[PDB]
Structure formats: C-alpha cells, structure tokens
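We emphasize that the prediction below concerns an isolated chain of 21 residues; any contacts that depend on oligomerization or on bound cofactors are therefore not represented. The input was used exactly as deposited, without trimming of termini.
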Amino acid sequence: SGSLSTFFRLFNRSFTQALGK
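Result of the prediction step, given as a token string:
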C-alpha cells in the first residue's frame, strides 16, 4: 500500500513544487 506510493509521490511532488521552488 500502499500504498502509499500515490500519496508519497503526491506529497513529494507538491512539496518540491511549492518549495520551488
């Protein structure tokens, strides 16, 4: 489950994109 894959990926992507920056 988990998954978590989707959740983990989403969190990482969102954090990286938000930080971004």
